[PDB]
Scaffold this active site. Structure first.
Site, mmCIF file in Angstrom:
data_model
loop_
_atom_site.group_PDB
_atom_site.id
_atom_site.type_symbol
_atom_site.label_atom_id
_atom_site.label_comp_id
_atom_site.label_asym_id
_atom_site.label_seq_id
_atom_site.Cartn_x
_atom_site.Cartn_y
_atom_site.Cartn_z
ATOM 1 N N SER A 103 -16.145 -6.273 8.750
ATOM 2 C CA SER A 103 -15.908 -6.292 7.282
ATOM 3 C C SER A 103 -16.534 -7.562 6.688
ATOM 4 C CB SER A 103 -14.425 -6.231 6.988
ATOM 5 O OG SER A 103 -13.723 -7.205 7.761
ATOM 6 N N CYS A 118 -5.382 -1.217 -1.485
ATOM 7 C CA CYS A 118 -6.500 -2.088 -1.927
ATOM 8 C C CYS A 118 -7.354 -1.327 -2.943
ATOM 9 C CB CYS A 118 -7.323 -2.594 -0.751
ATOM 10 S SG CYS A 118 -6.399 -3.705 0.316
ATOM 11 N N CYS A 176 0.847 -1.214 0.000
ATOM 12 C CA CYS A 176 0.000 0.000 0.000
ATOM 13 C C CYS A 176 0.880 1.261 0.000
ATOM 14 C CB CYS A 176 -0.929 -0.020 1.212
ATOM 15 S SG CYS A 176 -1.557 -1.693 1.547
#
Ligand code: FES
Ligand code: FES
Ligand code: FES
Ligand SMILES: [Mg+2]
Ligand SMILES: [Mg+2]
Ligand SMILES: [Mg+2]
Ligand SMILES: [Mg+2]
Ligand SMILES: [Mg+2]
Ligand SMILES: [Mg+2]
Ligand SMILES: [Mg+2]
Ligand SMILES: [Mg+2]
Ligand SMILES: [Mg+2]
Ligand code: NA
Lengths: 560, 555, 558
Positions: free
Chosen positions: A476, A201, A51
């Site tokens: 999630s 992501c 990331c």
């Protein structure tokens, strides 16, 4: 007229600053540089997660832009964690507190060195709100630049089929394998495909949601969020970000001139229109608190009731940020909302111009209709996120919006996720149950973990649409409209969630925005005498300090 | 030993498919999942010269870890400039940087399930910040210093030539404002003090704690002294990455090395180097993070039996590059061990003991000029004196460069009021100048005050007045760390203008000579000011920080 | 046992080496590192083209590999040019000479510093054969690592259509625009999409062809060519390349143990199976010359005859290198060829094992059938490339094929004169258009001409004219474009004696390119041949023209 050096005259100006000037010479400054504004370039670059990988080259390009505009940049680093690598073990307890450590890290350097302004670069989930919280707290000129999204990967499976995969596909593959429905070879194939190289992501998770929200807040250059990490357009946005911060200093503009109540309402509208992560409720509340701007859960309801869900994006939809980039990025949603009277056009931005003036300058196209629905054909006529109040959550809770019906169920109550997973394994969770995972709040967890194991196992057990999941933590990967998080007050604060016992009846009306416990108020209230918070698990170090200082999720789980 | 005590959480089993998949995107392949994962934590930045070398040294640590069969992963944390922060509101944010750095390393190491770390720091507070994280985590950890700056030489209008640093620039400013030096000469010193990369060359916090890190066994022996610009630092970096992987193979963690005896080694070496009084605050905090009992009386005990040997700035003549030339920190460590003033059996990051390390590297005897032999000390006892008594019941710290000093109290709430008084001539010979509300809570952030020490010396009152604070001092008798601090209603908060103060170095006493009953009758009249910082890191710090007497720890 | 320091005891061992040791300390060596092999890590990293951007991080990962295996790496840099950015101006004259400068560059550093072995990293077209030539010339342990391919870019056009585009699409966009067949808006849309970020051209141009050829030569780790530049698997291949070179030193293996005749035949077979660039003929001839291995244009004909076109990949086919990577990369082609008896399995490689041993160890899947065809269903029965000889090209010529043309010669000294005649309407259906003085010496630099092929193709003359040069051609006409005609015009080859009106025949099936004037009269003109004076009388191109050989032997400089 603005002082272009509102802080750095403390280290550059007059007879008394000889020692400071002598030290600044040793990092490269010469006679001509002492009259320039000093820009802190804060990067959460690291190799602990893909990331953050792009932030090394992007910080360099920011410094080139600062120099191009007559400033002097000084780079420094702070941490991030991996929200993906930390899943499934004790590290999940250290995700949200990283947000606080990043905001404090930036505050300390900016305050100690008397820098005039900053460009803040972040990739992974918690580092984006961490940087935006520091920018708000400091009230200096500040520009936010995102790392950019990862590219999609494609798995070849044993039966000759092929799918585009991401992190969630790896967690789900593990689950399929554990139920004997997928080979270890096919889990391996998915593992090798999910993350090709640099970038955050690709789905509409915290990182892309908050990168979009930063454009909407006017804290990022319009158009900067969507280009992939690997795409060299990010370099151009980086150089223009370094140029922009120097021009804000010339104008005498600071972060709190941009982070107004209206800018937060614009962020809410954009997040509601993207069906952004429910995490953006927590983060935008915290950023408002750090900007000393009044913002409540009810402001989320009010704005969200008027804004349609447009983005068909993962994890709940079809597309990823690279697809939003292809059809014109975040400015397409912002222009669609402005034209419909759903965005405050007059909000000042880091361009030095208003949101409306920025959108007039770059003239985004209309929504394509597939990635971003046309305003007349939305996924849902109101916001992608629903705020609830009621007797179980009098200080509020959050749920992803569904199409659906009212849900009523018998409470099944667990202290921590592990207990609920055990009960699911032993068959004591069935159709019509309301599964309640408490002591997962900012204080209780601690760290308000994003739980994915219980949602994964409920779906795998085929109970996805028949069970309600409720927590003072976060969820999630669950069914839309059946996973409720951020229940306040949390169990440790003796909220109604702490008073629940097996068999109590719970009602959720998403369209009516209500989450009620059906017990007689008086009878329910008097169990308050029996409540006792478990003793803190972490008694030393960063999590012990966090538990002592952290606020309710209802105000963004701020510590300051 | 299991070489992956932590990283099996991210690399091993079916359930770790997602973590493996993300680890592939930072470059790991099939053969790397079986390797220990080493966090390489860099406080590199460009905001101060002290941190500039850490970029190449982090890279060399990674090469070391790879050479030993590990997988390194680099990350960054903050550091501030103790020098650039001097003389403005930034000084309030120096000490708290230590706590943020410690927390930042803890967060990354705990979230990512790394097996061990190599921790790299340059400027004052980043060294103890890294050491505190290592102690708190109790994993394999090696600390590596950025190294010292090279000395710069200023040619002055009067043909003079001097080696100059930060204190020389601050003194030049004072001389120029009193008409005793040209602006030209101040500019010549400015241009010479810092030529490029490296931390302050004097025995300030950075060199004191780099030396203490060798003494703790947490840095490779010989690693502190080589200058930042010298490529021997690269070899120590590669050997630091090799060493941390070997600790994993032997199942050694930081608390195996940070024993009571290692802390007493560190105090011994700091006393012998004429180290910074800041080392008292930092070693107390590092012991707290290691769960090891360490008190101010431990400093007094070790200090009583350990002579000052190093002739080093700011009190002496030499800088760390001079110490390097004559054999570095191991020369002091062998001299102490030979005299039975060091615990030889302490385990170190080499996987061997302090005695075995010193036997392997055979350092030379003290040279007599930069380091003195034991029989030939700069002072027969440690430079750092611990006080107690009626003004400092929980302790205070003074550099004793051994008689009774006294004064009539002149009492100020914050440094500004003391400077305003020096300017108004209301501070005279024989005054005991008390600056209170500069503690961890009161300041906040326990500033190392330089304006009042500089102004007093510049006014010619250096040897004529006593300086006392619940904060800290740099430059200059100067008593700091007075505990309890004013905000906590310690005796310093009850002092009034006129009270008689006595400093007795021999007896280790700092007394207010008020009648104890009359003095205690003042307690009812005390009320602390409200916190100045009501938001952000300093509002949090004030809520959590301990007494300076136990290291100004937060948790 | 082999000495693991076959060269570096010249800088580490003995009293006389005190200075050299003191200098090596200053780059980081301590006492223990003097006993390690010293590995030159040569990177053509730069920012002048996206092709090279990944090489910085990959050079770093090579170093990690060398350290991991007990070596000491020393990084250094060489130039590269952009074959893409150089197109359409005077810069084109400096592309091929960069190959020779890169080769000399690595030779100089390796010989000066007495390094034991090298890892060579390249991205853009000419830099890969430059590095391979240096490896052959030095005959030390050497591993080659490619930058990797760029990702494909997606253009949305005013039309509402969407295309995957690259450089040729940008140049064809420009041609379509000036003929009123595409808007300026659509050219700009293509410009914005063709190159997103780091990596070499994704089609089977010189870089991907030579990266594939390097795996086939055994000079790169098997499977290393195909992963995109942006894919962190390249980092693992880099660390393993650093590990590999040290193990070659332990075994006493050098580059000429790997670059055998059989390994060049492997490289030819793989280039043919990929429908690879005709430039691969020039570069593999040069690498073989540098390796002291006999290789001729006849070898390309012999091997090319027996190898079918398998890869459905740009520019001929539909797919790019990222598609080849998806289906298991170059090892899928090499195993297919080995199983059919069209590859030499016993060739030693940089793994220290044979080609056969490597493919057995990594078990590549069979051709997928779309990106790579099985041999049963090839795209073309023989190689994409055809080698020609005849009265017009006695030392040979090269043409990309897919049948018999006879035409009247229209002769131009330089591409510009030919482009002028096309605009004049002097070049017409049936012409054999001859562009001479574009060879290694004549050009100078044997330019890959794209302006005449594009203009002919645009003018609808592709299928109607024969294009002939002593230079090279870039892009098809959809017709026949013959390059490398040797001897070149400067060396008084037949091409220099041609005149407006002569007739020329090209028989692809016969491998013939003839001038059909009567032998006796044609020879008569040799007496009046006078080469123009060199345009470049200073600098690198003046020296190049003095030393360069025929394209028939790879345009080597000695
Ligand atoms: S795990 Fe970093 S953005 Fe998803
Ligand atoms: S100011 Fe950084 S070590 Fe002195
Ligand atoms: S231009 Fe460099 S590979 Fe094509
Ligand atoms: Mg950088
Ligand atoms: Mg998250
Ligand atoms: Mg203002
Ligand atoms: Mg680096
Ligand atoms: Mg200091
Ligand atoms: Mg142990
Ligand atoms: Mg590099
Ligand atoms: Mg080319
Ligand atoms: Mg041999
Ligand atoms: Na539990």
């Amino acid at each position: 007229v603005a002082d272009i050096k509102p802080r750095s005259r403390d280290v550059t100006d007059g007879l008394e600053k000889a020692a400071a000037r002598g030290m600044l010479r040793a990092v490269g400054m010469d006679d001509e540089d002492f009259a320039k504004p000093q820009i802190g370039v804060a990067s959460s670059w690291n190799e602990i997660t893909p990331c953050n990988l792009s932030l090394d080259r992007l910080a360099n390009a920011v410094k080139e832009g600062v120099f191009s505009a007559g400033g002097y940049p000084l780079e420094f680093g702070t941490i991030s964690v991996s929200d993906g690598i930390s899943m499934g073990h004790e590290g999940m307890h250290f995700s949200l507190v990283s947000r606080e450590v990043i905001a404090d890290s930036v505050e300390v350097v900016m305050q100690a060195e008397r820098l005039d302004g900053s460009v803040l670069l972040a990739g992974c989930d918690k580092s984006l709100p961490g940087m935006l919280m520091a920018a708000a707290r400091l009230d200096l000129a500040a520009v936010f630049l995102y790392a950019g999204s990862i590219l999609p990967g494609r798995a070849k499976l044993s039966d000759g089929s092929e799918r585009d995969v991401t992190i969630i596909d790896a967690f789900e593959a593990v689950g399929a394998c554990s139920r004997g429905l997928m080979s270890r070879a096919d889990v391996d194939a998915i593992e090798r495909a999910i993350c090709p190289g640099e970038g955050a992501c690709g789905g509409m998770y915290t990182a892309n949601t908050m990168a979009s929200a930063a454009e909407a807040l006017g804290m990022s250059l319009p158009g900067s969020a969507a280009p992939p990490a690997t795409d060299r357009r990010r370099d151009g946005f980086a150089r223009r970000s370094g140029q922009a911060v120097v021009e804000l200093l010339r104008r005498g503009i600071t972060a709190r001139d941009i982070l107004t109540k209206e800018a937060f309402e614009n962020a809410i509208a954009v997040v509601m229109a993207f069906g952004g992560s429910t995490n953006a409720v927590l983060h935008l509340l915290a950023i408002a608190h750090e900007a000393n701007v009044a913002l409540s859960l009810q402001d989320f309801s009010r704005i969200g009731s008027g804004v349609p869900h447009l983005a068909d994006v993962k994890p709940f939809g079809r597309h990823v940020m690279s697809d939003v980039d292809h059809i014109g990025g975040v400015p397409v949603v912002m222009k669609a909302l402005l034209d419909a009277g759903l965005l405050h056009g007059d909000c000042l931005t880091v361009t030095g111009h208003t949101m409306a003036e920025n959108l007039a300058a770059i003239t985004p196209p209309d929504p394509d209709g597939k990635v971003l629905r046309a305003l007349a054909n939305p996924i849902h006529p109101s916001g992608g996120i629903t705020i609830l109040h009621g007797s179980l959550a009098p200080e509020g809770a959050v749920v992803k919006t569904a199409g659906s019906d009212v849900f009523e169920g018998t409470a099944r109550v667990f202290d921590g996720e592990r207990a609920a997973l055990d009960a699911l394994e032993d068959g004591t969770i069935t159709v019509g149950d309301a599964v309640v995972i408490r002591y997962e709040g900012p204080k209780g967890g601690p760290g308000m973990r994003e739980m994915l194991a219980i949602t994964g196992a409920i779906k795998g057990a085929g109970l996805g649409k028949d069970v309600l999941l409720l927590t003072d933590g976060r969820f999630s990967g669950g069914t839309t409209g059946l996973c409720v998080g951020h229940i306040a007050p949390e169990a440790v604060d003796g909220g109604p969630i702490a008073l629940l016992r097996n068999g109590d009846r719970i009602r959720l009306d998403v369209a009516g925005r209500v989450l009620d416990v059906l017990a007689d108020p008086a009878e329910f209230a008097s169990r308050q005498q029996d409540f006792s918070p478990p003793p803190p698990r972490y008694t030393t170090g960063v999590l012990s300090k966090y538990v002592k200082l952290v606020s309710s999720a209802a105000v963004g789980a701020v510590c300051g």
